[PDB]
Symmetry: C2
Amino acid sequence: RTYLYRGRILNLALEGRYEIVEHKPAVAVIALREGRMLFVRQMRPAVGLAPLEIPAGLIEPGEDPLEAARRELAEETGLSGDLTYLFSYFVSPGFTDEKTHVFLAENLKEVEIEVVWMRPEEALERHQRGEVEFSATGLVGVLYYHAFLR
Amino acid sequence: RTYLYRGRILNLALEGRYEIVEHKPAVAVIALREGRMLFVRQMRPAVGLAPLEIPAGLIEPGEDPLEAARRELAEETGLSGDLTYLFSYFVSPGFTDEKTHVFLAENLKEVEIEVVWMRPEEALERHQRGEVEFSATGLVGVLYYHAFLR
């Protein structure tokens, strides 16, 4: 485990042959209201475009997944709600250890990037038409809705 | 766009403040047979464990997504089938440009890591119990099934 770079949100290391990118764990929040899902968009220099995502972010020091989920929902959309843990996933285990914890938010209330309320059916259609790209969190939100929230 | 490292499956660059990891695009194949989903597991040094994934891999030079999907299904499970493009997603647009193209495989036939046939319902239950971890591809497969393949 030799380190080649120790950065802000990532570290680049080598385990002999394998190139490993260490990354802080993250959270994502799925929220549905009046048939619309709470998506967010922001310029992502890594991809050169703004994909359709759901409220998400990195877990800060001293914070657990649930707390980070609450914070991200508030900071990105100005909302708070009753959160329930759903599941987790490694974004790309072939090279990074980033693990994302997904939560469901209910009974939303306004307590205070681009907020994009959109019916998941429309988000899926737009994507199929090539009009918009998805982040893993955005796609997971869309699929989760079609599977359990209809 | 300053490069700090040019590796095998990734490049580490900087766009002033943003740390960007360039990565080859990938493919993932969702396949269902007799109610069981085709999962695969392999040791992932990046995470130190073997998460539940679906046949997947990097697109090779001169190959398009569909062709890579065919190859990965054959190389990892020894199967071939009729493939249909479903959707795509950026694994983590906050730092990497890795884009995954997801396909559905039908009418599987044996033409020639660990092959794990499992009912998606069981995969979800095991995960909820903390018995197994999911890769983004594995979770997407599970959610897609519950949403459109039941």
